[PDB]
Write an enzyme that holds these catalytic residues in place. Structure first.
Site, mmCIF file in Angstrom:
data_model
loop_
_atom_site.group_PDB
_atom_site.id
_atom_site.type_symbol
_atom_site.label_atom_id
_atom_site.label_comp_id
_atom_site.label_asym_id
_atom_site.label_seq_id
_atom_site.Cartn_x
_atom_site.Cartn_y
_atom_site.Cartn_z
ATOM 1 C CG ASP A 44 -5.306 5.826 8.477
ATOM 2 O OD1 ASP A 44 -4.858 6.289 7.832
ATOM 3 O OD2 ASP A 44 -6.426 4.303 7.808
ATOM 4 C CE1 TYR A 94 -2.726 -4.550 -3.485
ATOM 5 C CE2 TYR A 94 -4.844 -3.095 -2.999
ATOM 6 C CZ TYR A 94 -3.897 -2.872 -3.376
ATOM 7 O OH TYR A 94 -2.765 -1.889 -3.771
ATOM 8 C CG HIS A 151 -3.150 2.850 6.261
ATOM 9 N ND1 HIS A 151 -4.839 3.463 6.577
ATOM 10 C CD2 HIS A 151 -3.128 2.294 5.622
ATOM 11 C CE1 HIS A 151 -5.344 2.869 5.603
ATOM 12 N NE2 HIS A 151 -4.345 2.152 4.604
ATOM 13 C CB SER A 200 -6.529 -0.133 2.829
ATOM 14 O OG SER A 200 -5.205 0.677 2.721
HETATM 15 S S1 LIG Z 1 -1.016 -1.969 -3.800
HETATM 16 O O1 LIG Z 1 -0.873 -2.936 -2.029
HETATM 17 O O2 LIG Z 1 -0.723 -2.400 -4.676
HETATM 18 C C1 LIG Z 1 -1.010 -0.560 -3.535
HETATM 19 C C2 LIG Z 1 -0.430 -0.018 -1.837
HETATM 20 C C3 LIG Z 1 -0.244 1.659 -1.290
HETATM 21 C C4 LIG Z 1 -0.210 2.453 -2.593
HETATM 22 C C5 LIG Z 1 0.007 4.155 -2.022
HETATM 23 C C6 LIG Z 1 -2.471 4.082 -2.670
HETATM 24 N N1 LIG Z 1 -2.115 5.464 -1.040
HETATM 25 C C7 LIG Z 1 -0.576 1.867 -4.103
HETATM 26 C C8 LIG Z 1 -1.475 0.683 -4.172
#
Ligand SMILES: *S(=O)(=O)c1ccc(CCN)cc1
Ligand SMILES: *[C@@H]1O[C@H](CO)[C@@H](O[C@@H]2O[C@H](CO)[C@@H](O[C@@H]3O[C@H](CO)[C@@H](O)[C@H](O)[C@@H]3O)[C@H](O)[C@H]2NC(C)=O)[C@H](O)[C@H]1NC(C)=O
Ligand SMILES: *[C@@H]1O[C@H](CO)[C@@H](O[C@@H]2O[C@H](CO)[C@@H](O)[C@H](O)[C@H]2NC(C)=O)[C@H](O)[C@H]1NC(C)=O
Ligand SMILES: *[C@@H]1O[C@H](CO)[C@@H](O[C@@H]2O[C@H](CO)[C@@H](O)[C@H](O)[C@H]2NC(C)=O)[C@H](O)[C@H]1NC(C)=O
Ligand SMILES: *[C@@H]1O[C@H](CO)[C@@H](O[C@@H]2O[C@H](CO)[C@@H](O)[C@H](O)[C@H]2NC(C)=O)[C@H](O)[C@H]1NC(C)=O
Ligand SMILES: *[C@@H]1O[C@H](CO)[C@@H](O)[C@H](O)[C@H]1NC(C)=O
Ligand SMILES: *[C@@H]1O[C@H](CO)[C@@H](O)[C@H](O)[C@H]1NC(C)=O
Ligand SMILES: *[C@@H]1O[C@H](CO)[C@@H](O)[C@H](O)[C@H]1NC(C)=O
Ligand SMILES: *[C@@H]1O[C@H](CO)[C@@H](O)[C@H](O)[C@H]1NC(C)=O
Ligand SMILES: *[C@@H]1O[C@H](CO)[C@@H](O)[C@H](O)[C@H]1NC(C)=O
Ligand SMILES: *[C@@H]1O[C@H](CO)[C@@H](O)[C@H](O)[C@H]1NC(C)=O
Ligand SMILES: *[C@@H]1O[C@H](CO)[C@@H](O)[C@H](O)[C@H]1NC(C)=O
Ligand SMILES: *[C@@H]1O[C@H](CO)[C@@H](O)[C@H](O)[C@H]1NC(C)=O
Ligand SMILES: *S(=O)(=O)c1ccc(CCN)cc1
Lengths: 728, 728
Positions: A670, A509, A702, A592
């Site tokens: 997406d 991530y 997405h 992502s």
């Molecule tokens: S993360 O999983 O902490 C996370 C997920 C989704 C967002 C929104 C960004 N478009 C930010 C951080």
């Protein structure tokens, strides 16, 4: 012999993890759906009664997607014809059912395609958004009163957020807030007139002869942003032949001077509201506490009631500044902010003074404030055992901050190290939600004695089932990088032989404030990879990761794609020396931000990874949205940060992909990380003469979450990994 | 010699095939570019003289990609700044150079972004299209005079075709026709007002922050079509203070009655023009010969001068009705039409009579009429040796159809079996172009005695280079399918070992009137597969294929996706029996219609093919354009042919793909077979739980022709086939 956890087990959810969702409706009662009936539970004694019999649902004539009971318990709202929009937004039809006369209301019904609806906090008033305008219904059977007339598709949004506020600011579609006693209805209006449109094809059902073009006002980095206005409506004067009485509250001058965002609304009392605003740069925010002036109806601001929060090493808050938690009287509040050591802790503020006093301190962080009474404050932190990926509920004495008790730390120490909580009104009772490392456990507690009243769900059914299967184990530990200890986790194959050399998949991530290493229990694709295919799946939280202080989190400020990518490579290099890792078979994958890091890692030319899979990856920051991107990167201009925007694209590393096997996946619909990102990436790879594999997913968004696409993408990725690892 | 023809050889064109392009300008002279300059060759003596020295090319802007000398040889147009649009269309900048004064025209320049331009047939007038409107310039140095004022992007086209007419009707962008002596300028106007738009994203250079949406009026099957108007302008009255004198010629009543297309325009004399129209259904066409009425300026038609051509078993002509070739006086004409036996032969028509007389006959076909004089008619046919995949030039005496001589058949029998020809102004001389089976050979001949005269290009250089390379051999033969003899070709690996079992790749086209089997020499991807990878590549022409009579060609009328697909399977089954073919390793691939057939074959559940690759395939006929689709399928309505449209989609065969390894490839900017087609196909395979591979090509169109994408696709397909065939 024993069965292992298979891909089909994962895809079909054969092993079901149970939970227990309740809705507190008073200080000692909660509603719970059981066998499709709505039951009313009494915490004081554990007994319950039927609130709504499931026969009622048989009688409706439609699949009921959800319901919401009026606070005075006289009506219930039924939601059906659910149509998902973005991550949080959707539209639906609604019926109001009278619980007294147990009849469905058929007069002055709520319109179809309604975007948002909510009961007032007391009584049974309703406010809803339809066609981007707000409407208020004082009585379920009475005609509604229109509040705004400017709503316009893709341009003006009243009471609901536009795309970027939904996704990056509020993490919600709703933009309306009733006062505690229902006197006032506050709402925000977003104006997207000048925001550029992202456009992409949507193919729809095979019978559609021509594709449609979806258009969404979406500001990419440095582009024109939506503007916002905030209003408070006095609902007492709403009447068919009356105008709407409302007052616009503007942000303080220090934020008004340039682009800004409204990022928080908090009702304090019936005559006091707290607004939180942030500059477009996001390293300067301000709380403005406005008081209602009864003689003129306006909401007055004062410099004395303003509280500024800034960051000199990065941005304010984790993803937005933390929300203030006010006392009942509204004269002071508690809020999480970074302390002098760079750790997020709770500070106590007096509403009309600027200095605050920290009530928590230490090399760990408070995650969130959960409940507040005149005598105690309840919060969640990762203090216990000093593990950032753990979570526990603590209670602190307001008259003596040195008196803090951990309420969940010792309940089930081996089974439960990650908790969330839900308190009843006035915090008389709380439900504790244990999410791992063992099977999820839901319990109910009394705040006055801290006795566990009962187990609500212990997953005994799942427990049984898993005893026949060869489940993998999840281990957490630490390593040192550049003199700092960082955490990692490994999902290890069953019968793990420290002697043998296993292939290793790095699941990544790694975005700013990310936390991929935790004690949460999950049945995931990784579970299958470890149990059936004998692959070790590891994750690592390096620089830029969260919940470990700003020194770690802000390390990637204005330089996304640098340290967090390098740390994944260094961590893996150390993993590859642990002796049980087959260095000839190391892969990396992510979705992502994780797809971006996976790609940057493969493009690094480290020689560590044989192959990798990026799903819906960001490939170039100028293609992502303004709010998120700028928070960490500033503006893509020569005067500011263009240089770091330029050398942080995955395309800039195209040449190094010649040494790896790469699989690029993206849904064509997406709306978040545009297919454009992968389309520009593949083009750069083709231009560099790099061979690689691709997989587009038609009309998937997405989440690439439709039932068949979900099964398809994991099946496809499993095949790719097994071929990379020479696994039959 | 021990090296092979490699993928790099193919991709980088290491082995150059030379050709000889000339432009006839008189009955005995031609222009040819040699070492950057234009030479004027005298066919007779073979002596040349400089017509326009090199260096005179001052790389104006970019570079001169084409030239055109005015008929009176007083001027020359230089084309540069070439910008491609669709298959034939493009815009360019033009400079006019005065051959007398040997100066560049500097005033009254041709506009930038000119869509089409052409010299009158005599003298040096110019007509050009710019911004969809027509302009005429009587003198290069004088200002041009505007002819039309209705030009409108995506709506009204004057002098050039819209998308569907360019691709499917004219196979050209031009829609302007000067009369023989330049008095009149005929043009067509296309009106796309009601034609729906296909829309798709174009990402452009990486620097473009937001993708662009391309929109093209494109009628899919059954959709509203563009309408057309044909006008004849009298250029004698063009003056700045004068209106335009023009006359609109409408089609005969039998066509004017419903949707129609203008498909042919042939000037006969300065006062007679021949228009060929066809009904939308394309099984009824009519030639209308209109005569100029000097007293009123009208162009008059008469029933006596109308000639009807219909088809009860299919469509008219091969892709459109064949063009009439009129005699000098315009009193009669020769045109190719179907025999009583279904074979396309030349018929002699009297301009004012309805019955015609066939001047050729036999179980073979005339491909086209190349030249006509008062005494002879030259045509190309596949009569020689009864091989429909061969082409030779013939001459038939007009006063005795018994006297027909083959002029190319015996020139070089083993090396040359496929020719095209290019004749000088009164057919006094002709260039013969041999395309195979040996290396291409270009020669110059005189019509008087058919003397060989000289060799223009013999490719001796390529020949010398190829003697050191292990080249595969191409063999043609026939197989019998359900009582009919059909042709096939096989490209066999060098040093072929009959004791070995070779993998087999079927390369397919198979569209209506297609011809995949021929004696043309090609250095292709297949050459590489056979030479280096020891893969046999075969092609087969079955039902629906052309140049073998209407019984075979019309076999697939109103049923695309049936017999041509089945015949590829049946033919391959026969090939699989050959002892030197490994029947457990047969693959099939194709582009466009071939991608469609490849996909239909793979979805047939025949068990014959292990894998296949479809590039930019049609997947559902309702997604393809009206002109092509309806010609073969009628309308997608229940009253007409909806049932065959519905069960001829590739998606209807999704379940069967679970039995094969499939690679689906498509350019995202394909304006012809829309990316939509593959997007819908992939979604159906995903929905059926079928695994397969895809490869999108960002911003590539129907030809996936850019330098890097061309290399990338063939490299990617090569790896997919080697993996399917277990080849190192
Ligand atoms: S993360 O999983 O902490 C996370 C997920 C989704 C967002 C929104 C960004 N478009 C930010 C951080
Ligand atoms: C409407 O409400 C009634 C309750 O009054 C529902 O009946 C209940 O249905 C559940 C679900 O099947 C039954 O539970 C099952 O019990 C066995 C215990 O041995 C267990 O093996 C299953 O996993 C499940 O827990 C429950 O016994 C039954 N209760 C009654 C009163 O009969 C009914 O299902 C609801 N109707 C609909 C359409 O949802
Ligand atoms: C973009 O360029 C900057 C500056 O060249 C890179 O930062 C340097 O990275 C090297 C290699 O890791 C370090 O040794 C230097 O200390 C860094 N210099 C600075 C000024 O930070 C940065 O890594 C590049 N970004 C990406 C994504 O490649
Ligand atoms: C192109 O064709 C359209 C019809 O498809 C023409 O538009 C019509 O014009 C007439 C006269 O102006 C109007 O009465 C109709 O209402 C129009 N049809 C519609 C609905 O658009 C248009 O004039 C044509 N253009 C040219 C130059 O021929
Ligand atoms: C669409 O359906 C038609 C009608 O059933 C199919 O035609 C039949 O094809 C079978 C071959 O399996 C023959 O035995 C029959 O003689 C055909 N009947 C007719 C009416 O021609 C046709 O093949 C189907 N098309 C596709 C693409 O599958
Ligand atoms: C539970 O029992 C108490 C009395 O013991 C009663 O007052 C209460 O209403 C009951 N709650 C329900 C709804 O079961
Ligand atoms: C929205 O903003 C535009 C300027 O970007 C302005 O012209 C327009 O009046 C605004 N609309 C509303 C309802 O505020
Ligand atoms: C509001 O005005 C309308 C007339 O336009 C009338 O029908 C209705 O009675 C009025 N209602 C009230 C609140 O008096
Ligand atoms: C906030 O960011 C802006 C723009 O990058 C910068 O000028 C300013 O100094 C920052 N504020 C602080 C206190 O760091
Ligand atoms: C022009 O022609 C001469 C021979 O006449 C040739 O040598 C020269 O290379 C040509 N110039 C070029 C390269 O265009
Ligand atoms: C070829 O030579 C003849 C004389 O033998 C001459 O008349 C003719 O113009 C020449 N052709 C050219 C243009 O080279
Ligand atoms: C055409 O009109 C122009 C108007 O500027 C005029 O000057 C010119 O003389 C006219 N042509 C003639 C000579 O009739
Ligand atoms: C031409 O096609 C139409 C249907 O598109 C049909 O009604 C008609 O019978 C056909 N005419 C001939 C001569 O086959
Ligand atoms: S085939 O090669 O005879 C052929 C090529 C191109 C077309 C145009 C289709 N839009 C038709 C047939």
């Amino acid at each position: 012999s024993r069965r292992t956890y298979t891909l089909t087990d994962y895809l079909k959810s054969t092993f079901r993890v149970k939970f227990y969702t309740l809705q507190w409706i008073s200080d000692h009662e909660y509603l719970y759906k059981q066998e499709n009936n709505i039951l009313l539970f009494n915490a004081e004694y554990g007994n319950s009664s039927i609130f709504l019999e499931n026969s009622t649902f048989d009688e409706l004539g439609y699949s009921t997607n959800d319901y919401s009971v009026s606070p005075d318990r006289q009506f219930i709202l039924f939601e059906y014809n659910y149509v998902k929009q973005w991550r949080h937004s959707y539209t639906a039809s609604y019926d109001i059912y009278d619980l007294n006369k147990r009849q469905l209301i058929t007069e002055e019904r709520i319109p179809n395609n309604t975007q948002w609806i909510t009961w007032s906090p007391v009584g049974h008033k309703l406010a809803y958004v339809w066609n981007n305008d707000i409407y208020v219904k004082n009585e379920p059977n009475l005609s509604s009163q229109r509040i705004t007339w400017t709503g316009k598709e893709n341009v003006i949004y009243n009471g609901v957020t536009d795309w970027v506020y939904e996704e990056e600011v509020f993490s919600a579609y709703s933009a309306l807030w009733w006062s505690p006693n229902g006197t006032f209805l506050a709402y925000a209006q977003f104006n997207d007139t000048e925001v550029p449109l992202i456009e992409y094809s949507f193919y729809s059902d095979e019978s559609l002869q021509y594709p449609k073009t979806v258009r969404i006002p979406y500001p990419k980095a440095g582009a024109e942003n939506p503007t916002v206005k905030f209003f408070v409506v006095d609902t007492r004067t709403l009447s068919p032949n009356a105008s709407v009485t409302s007052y616009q509250i503007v942000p303080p001058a220090s934020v008004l001077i340039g682009d800004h965002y409204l990022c928080g609304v908090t009702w304090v009392t019936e005559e006091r509201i707290s607004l939180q605003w942030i500059r477009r740069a996001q390293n300067y925010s301000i709380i403005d506490i406005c008081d209602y002036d009864e003689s003129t109806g306006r909401w007055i601001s004062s410099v004395a009631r303003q509280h500024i929060e800034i960051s000199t090493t990065g941005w304010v808050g984790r993803f937005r500044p933390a929300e203030p938690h006010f006392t009942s009287d509204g004269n002071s509040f508690y809020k999480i902010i970074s302390n002098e050591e760079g750790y997020k802790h709770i500070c106590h503020f007096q509403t009309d003074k600027s200095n605050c006093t920290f009530i928590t301190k230490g090399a760990w962080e408070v995650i969130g404030i959960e409940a507040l009474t005149s005598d105690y404050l309840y919060y969640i932190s990762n203090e216990h055992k000093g593990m950032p990926g753990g979570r526990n509920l603590y209670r602190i004495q307001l008259n003596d901050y040195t008196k803090v008790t951990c309420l969940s730390c010792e309940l089930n120490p081996e089974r439960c190290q990650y908790y969330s909580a839900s308190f009843s009104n006035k915090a008389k009772y709380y439900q504790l939600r244990c999410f791992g490392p063992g099977l999820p456990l839901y319990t109910l507690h009394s705040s006055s004695s801290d006795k566990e009243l009962r187990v609500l769900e212990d997953n005994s059914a799942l427990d049984k089932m898993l005893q026949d299967v060869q489940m993998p184990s999840k281990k957490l530990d630490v390593i040192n990088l550049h003199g700092t200890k960082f955490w990692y986790q490994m999902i290890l194959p069953p019968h793990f032989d420290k002697s043998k050399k296993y292939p290793l998949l790095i699941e990544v991530y790694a975005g700013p404030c990310s936390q991929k290493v935790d004690t949460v229990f999950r049945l995931s694709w990784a579970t299958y990879l470890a149990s059936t295919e004998n692959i070790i799946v590891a994750s690592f939280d390096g620089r830029g990761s969260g919940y470990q202080g700003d020194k770690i989190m802000h390390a990637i400020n204005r330089r996304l794609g640098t340290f967090e990518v390098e740390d994944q490579i260094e961590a893996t290099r150390q993993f590859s020396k642990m002796g049980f890792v087959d260095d000839k078979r190391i892969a990396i994958w992510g979705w992502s931000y994780g797809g971006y890091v996976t790609s940057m890692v493969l493009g690094a030319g480290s020689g560590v990874f044989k192959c990798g899979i990026a799903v819906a990856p960001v490939s170039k920051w100028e293609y992502y949205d303004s709010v998120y991107t700028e928070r960490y990167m500033g503006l893509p201009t020569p005067e500011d940060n263009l240089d770091y925007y330029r050398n942080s694209t995955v395309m800039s590393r195209a040449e190094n992909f010649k040494q790896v096997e790469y699989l690029l996946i993206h849904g064509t619909a997406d709306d978040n990380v545009h297919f454009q990102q992968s389309a520009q990436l593949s083009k750069a790879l083709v231009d560099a003469g790099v061979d690689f594999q691709t997989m587009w997913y038609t009309d998937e968004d997405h989440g690439i979450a439709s039932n068949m696409a979900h099964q398809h993408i994991y099946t496809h990725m499993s095949h790719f990994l097994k071929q990379c690892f020479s696994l039959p």
